[PDB]
Swiss-Prot record:
Highly expressed in rapidly proliferating tissues (spleen, placenta, and peripheral blood leukocytes). Also expressed in brain, heart, skeletal muscle, colon, thymus, kidney, liver, small intestine and lung. Residues 147-189 are annotated as: Activation segment. It comes from Homo sapiens. Homodimer; homodimerization is required for activation segment autophosphorylation. It is found in: Cell membrane. Changing K242E: In TGCT; somatic mutation. This is Serine/threonine-protein kinase 10. It is linked to Testicular germ cell tumor: A common malignancy in males representing 95% of all testicular neoplasms. TGCTs have various pathologic subtypes including: unclassified intratubular germ cell neoplasia, seminoma (including cases with syncytiotrophoblastic cells), spermatocytic seminoma, embryonal carcinoma, yolk sac tumor, choriocarcinoma, and teratoma. Autophosphorylates following homodimerization, leading to activation of the protein. Inhibition by erlotinib, an orally administered EGFR tyrosine kinase inhibitor used for treatment, enhances STK10-dependent lymphocytic responses, possibly leading to the aggravation of skin inflammation observed upon treatment by erlotinib. Residues 14-259 form the Protein kinase domain. The lineage of its organism: Eukaryota, Metazoa, Chordata, Craniata, Vertebrata. Serine/threonine-protein kinase involved in regulation of lymphocyte migration. Phosphorylates MSN, and possibly PLK1. Involved in regulation of lymphocyte migration by mediating phosphorylation of ERM proteins such as MSN. Acts as a negative regulator of MAP3K1/MEKK1. May also act as a cell cycle regulator by acting as a polo kinase kinase: mediates phosphorylation of PLK1 in vitro; however such data require additional evidences in vivo. ATP binds at K39. Belongs to the protein kinase superfamily. STE Ser/Thr protein kinase family. STE20 subfamily.
Amino acid sequence: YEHVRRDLDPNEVWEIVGELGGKVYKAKNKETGALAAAKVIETKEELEDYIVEIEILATCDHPYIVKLLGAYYHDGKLWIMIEFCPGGAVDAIMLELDRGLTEPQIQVVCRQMLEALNFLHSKRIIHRDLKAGNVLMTLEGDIRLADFGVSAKNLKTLQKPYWMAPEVVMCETMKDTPYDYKADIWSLGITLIEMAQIEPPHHELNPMRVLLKIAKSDPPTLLTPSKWSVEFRDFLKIALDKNPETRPSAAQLLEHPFVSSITSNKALRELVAEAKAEVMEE
Ligand SMILES: Cc1nc(Nc2ncc(C(=O)Nc3c(C)cccc3Cl)s2)cc(N2CCN(CCO)CC2)n1
Ligand SMILES: [Ca+2]
C-alpha cells in the first residue's frame, strides 16, 4: 500500500474536531481515538512538493521526529495527518512563559535534536529549517522535529565542468555530502541561542541585512556568558564553525560533555507542565 492513499476515504477514519491556525485543523481518529494535526489542502501541478514531504516523513520513523499518521488524496483535497504534539512549539512556550529555557532544558532539547539529526543525516535527509518554532513538545517532555517543507522542496529540486567558476563548484559541493548536512549543525547552534535568549542573534536587524551579517560577522556567542556553563559555550564554539569542512557532525557532537551525560528528559517535562499551567491563567 503506497504512502499517499488513493483507495480509502479520509472521512471514514478521520473526523475534524477544531482548529489551531494556511489552516491547521485538529482531527480525531474514529477507530483508535488518537489525535492528529491535520492539513486539508486543495490544489490538484506542484502538489509533488507535498508528496515528497510526505515520503520524507514516512521514511523518518523516529521518536524525536513528528509521526506521519496518514496521507490521503481524495476528490481534489490532499489530507496530511500528523501526530498531535500537545505542548506546541518551543518558541510559543517561551512567549507564553515570557522567558528563555534554562540550561538543563536546553541540554535535553540539544541531546534529542542531535539524535534526530544523526538519524536524518544517516538517511541523507537534511532539514534545512531548524528553529525553536519547528521543535514541538509532547506532554511527556520529548521533542518532535516538525515542518519538512524546506527539506522536501530542496529534495524535489535535486531529484528532478572544466569551465565552471570556483564559487559555482563550491555551491555544488555544498549541495552534496559530506558538506550539505553541516548546515543543520549550524542551525542547531543558533536554535540553542534562540532558546537561551528568546530571539535569535541579529533579531534587531531586518531580514535582508541579516543575510549579509551572517556572511560577514564572526560566529554568534551567548550574550551573558557568565550565566552558562563552559560546556554550553564550548558546544556553541565548535558547532557554530563558519567553515563547514571542520564543523563537526551530529554523531560527533553527541559525544560532547554538554549532552553526553544527559540521561533524563525531566527538565523538559517540567517546562511543558509549567507552560500548560500558565495557559490556564485567566
Ligand atoms: C499550532 C499548534 N500545533 C500543535 N501541535 C502540532 N503537532 C504537530 C504539528 C505539525 O506537524 N504541523 C504541521 C502540519 C500538520 C503540516 C505541515 C507543517 C506543519 Cl509544522 S503542529 C499544538 C498547538 N497547540 C495549541 C496552543 N497551545 C494550547 C492552548 O494554548 C499548545 C498546543 N498549536
Ligand atoms: Ca517570534
